[PDB]
Amino acid sequence: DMARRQTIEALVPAWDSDIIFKCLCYFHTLYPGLIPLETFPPATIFNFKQKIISILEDKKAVLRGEPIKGPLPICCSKENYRRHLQRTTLLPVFMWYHPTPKTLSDTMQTMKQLAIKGSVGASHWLLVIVDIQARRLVYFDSLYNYVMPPENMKKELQSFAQQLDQVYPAYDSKKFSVKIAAKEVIQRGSGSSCGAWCCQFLHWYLKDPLTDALNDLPVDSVERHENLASFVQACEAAVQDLPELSWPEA
Template identity: 35%
Template sequence: MEPIHNPPPQTCSYSRPSTTYTSFKDASCGTKVTRIIIALFLIVISCGLILCAYTFRDLLDADYSAQEGPQQATKLLQQLDKVLTGPPLPIWDNEHLFQFSCLMQNKHRRVLPIDICNPLTKFNFLEYICNCLMTKQSVNVNETDMCELFCPPTCTPENYRRLLCTSSVFPFVMWHDPSADTQEAMLTKMDQTMSSGRVGNSHWVLVIVDIEHRCVTFFDSFYNYIASPQQMREQLEGLAASLGAIYPKEGGSDSDQEELLSPFQVRIGSTVKVQSPGEFTCGAWCCQFLAWYLENPDFDLEEKVPTNPSERRALLADFISTTEQAMSRYSSLSWPTTD
C-alpha cells in the first residue's frame, strides 16, 4: 500500500498593489484629460473663495477699465478734464450738514438746525417731518410738557424748546442708497457705509419746510436719484396737505374751512443735474441750496448754477472754502443757543 501524500495547504497571500506615478508627459491621454479637469476645478474653487473674501462694497469700489477706441478714449478724457480740474472737493457728511445748519441758524435765526441723530430715508421722512412740525405747534401753544419733549442728545430740552418756538424754516436731509428696499435695509446700509469709510452709492437730498411761505421744497443734486420729479411731487403733496392741516392759514374766514386748511405749495428745486459725475458733493450742494434759499426762497437754481462743469465746480469749491472755517465752531456737535 502506497503512502498517501497530501498536498501542502494553500495559503492566500495579499500583496499591496504598486502605485506608479508617471509624469504628465508620459501619462496616457485619458490620464492627461483627468488631470486637466481636476486642475481647472481647483482653480475655479480657489477663485470663488477669494471672491467670497471680498465684501460687496469692495467689489463696487474696485477699478475696472475697458478698452475703447482712440476717438472714444480721447473724448472721455476731454470730458473728465473739464470736470476734474483742481484738487478733489471734500465730502460733506451728516456732521458737516449739521454744522452748516447751525451756521445758518446763527445768521438767520429762523432756521432749526438739522437733527442728525434721527436718520431720515424715503421710508420714514413724511411721518418724521409731520411729527416735528406738530411738536412745534404744541410747543407754541404750551401743550407739550418738558418731560415729553424729545430733543437731540447734544441739546438741552429748554434750548430745543426755544429753538422750536423761534424757527419757521425746517431743513431735513434724507440719506439714500438705491440697493435698499426697506427702512431696515436702508439703516443697515448706512451703518455699513459709515464703517467702510466709502461713499459707494449713498446720496444726500434736502427737504425744506417753510411755515411762513407755506412751502415744501425738495432738492436733489442728481435731480432724480431717489425717484422721478413727478413721483417726488406726489409724495410731497401728501406731506403738504398734512402740513396745511397742522398750520391753517392766518386771517382766513372761519366759514371757509377748505381755504383755512389749504395745503402747502410743493416746489421741486432741482430741474437739472448740478453734481458732476465722479464727485461726491451731494452734501455740499444741499448746503449751498439751503444758503441760496435763505437769501431768497423764490430763487431759480438754473440762474445760480453755471452750465459749464468747470465753472460749476469752481463755484462749489469757493462756497466750501469760505464756509468750512466758520462751520468749525460747531465741530463739537452742540446745538446753538438762542441767548
C-alpha cells in the same frame, strides 16, 4: 474728461453728516428761523414724512405751552430745543438715500455699515426744506432724479402737503405748496458733491426763498464746482471755531 472728473472730485469732495450739521448750526446763527436738525441719524425717504409731522406737532405743543411728545435731539438741552421749536420757521430736513435698501430698517443698517467702513458708495444727500412761513415744501436733488422722476416726487409731495395742511393749518386757508427745485442734473460731472450742493442750495434759499439760482448756474460743469468749492471754503472757515456736536442757543 478723466482730468475733468478728477478735478471736479478734487474741487468738491463728499461732505459728511458732521460738516452738514455744523453748517446747519452756523446757518441758524445767521437765520434764526432755521432749526438745525441733527443729521445723526438723518431722515430717509421712508420716514421723512413722519419726522416732519412729529416736529410740527411738537412745535404746536410748544406754542400752546405744553410738553413735547416727540424725541429730543442728542446735542441740545430740552429747554433750548423748546426755544428752537418756538422760534423755527424753516425745517432743513436732510435725507440720506441709497437705491439698495427698500425699507427704513434696511436703510439704517446700510447707513451704519458704510459709516464704520467709511464709504460714500452710491449714497446720496437729499434736502427737503419745510418752509413754515411760506408754507412751501422744496425738494432738492442735486442728481435730479436719483430717487424717482421729479414729476412723481411732485405728486407724492402734493399729497403730503395736503396732510401738512391738516396737521399744521394756517391762520387762513393757505395750503402748503411744493417746489421741485432741480430741473436738470445740478451735480454735473461729480459723484460726490451732493452734500455741499444741498447746503449751497439751502443758503441760496435762506437768502431768497424765491431764488432762481439753479437756473442761473453756469453751463460748464467745472465752473459750477469751482464756485461750489469757494462756498465750501467759506463754510469751513466760518464753522472752524464753532462747538462740536452742540446746538446753538435758539
